[PDB]
Protein: CMP-sialic acid transporter
Amino acid sequence: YCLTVMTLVAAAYTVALRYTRTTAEELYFSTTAVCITEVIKLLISVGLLAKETGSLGRFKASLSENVLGSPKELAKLSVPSLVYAVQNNMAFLALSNLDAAVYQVTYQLKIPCTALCTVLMLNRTLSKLQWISVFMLCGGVTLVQWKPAVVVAQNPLLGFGAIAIAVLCSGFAGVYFEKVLKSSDTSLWVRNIQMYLSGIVVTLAGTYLSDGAEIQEKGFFYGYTYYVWFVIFLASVGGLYTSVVVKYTDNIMKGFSAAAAIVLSTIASVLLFGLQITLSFALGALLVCVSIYLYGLPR
Ligand SMILES: Nc1ccn([C@@H]2O[C@H](COP(=O)(O)O)[C@@H](O)[C@H]2O)c(=O)n1
Structure:
C-alpha cells in the first residue's frame, strides 16, 4: 500500500501542479498551497497519534510530554521545516516555468545529494560498489522519467535555479529528519507533529513576506480550483508517506524503492491497460533493477 500510494502520488503530483500553473486565467499564490499542505499533514498526523496511543488520555499525555514539554525537539525540527518550506516552494516555482518531464529528470539529482548527506550526517558508509549503484539508479530514473515536451510567461533559467535549490534541500532536510527520528524511541507521528507545527509558521510567514501585499488585494485562496486542492491533497499524502518510508528503511532506500515502484507500476499498466512505453524507460528500468541488486550485496 505505502509504495502504491507513493507512486500514484508521484505520477499525479508534478503533472497536476504543472497543469494548475499553466492553464489558469486567475492564478493562485503557490506559497499558500505549501502552507495549507503542512496544516493538512499536521491534522492527519494528530489523527494517527490518537490511533497509536489508542486512548484520549494517552493521546493528551503524549502531546503534553512530547510537544508541550519538549521545546528542544521543536527547536531542532524547525530547521528541516525551514528547509522544506524552501524546497516545497521551489517545486511550485520550477513547475510554473518548466515542463514536467524536464522537472522530473533534473530533480533526480536529489538521489546523489541524499546519499552524500546520509554519509555525512548519519555516521554511515557506502562502499565503492554502493556508490556505483547510486549513480546507476540516478541514470536509470533519468531514463525512466525522460519524455518529449504554456500560454503564460515562462523563465526556464529561474525554473532550473529552483530545482538546484530544491535538490540541496531534499538531501539535507530529509536526512536531518531521519537523524532526529532514529535518535530516540519517540513516535513517528510525534516527530511529524513537532515538525509540521513549525512548518505551518515558517510557510505562512513566507506567504506573508512573498505575497502578503497582493493577497491583501486579491485574497489568500484566490485562484483555487478543484485541481489546486488535489495538488495539496497529493502533497500532504506524499509528505506523510515519505516519512513512513524513512522510518522503515532510510533516505537512500527511499530512492531505490520509489524507482522500483514507478518501474513495476508502469509495467503493471502495460499488461493491464495496453500502456505504451519508450525505449528510454525500458533501459532505465533495467538499470534500476541492476542498481538495487548491486546496492543490496554484502560489503
Ligand atoms: N517527515 C516528513 C518528511 C518529509 N515530508 C515531505 O516529503 C517531501 C519530501 O520530498 P523529497 O523526498 O523529494 O525530498 C516534501 O514535500 C516534505 O515536505 C513530510 O511531509 N514529512
Q: What stands out?
A: The pocket of cytidine-5'-monophosphate is lined by residues 41, 84, 88, 110, 170, 174, 177, 192, 195, 235, 239-240, 242-243 (CB under 6 Å). The longest helix spans residues 188-218.
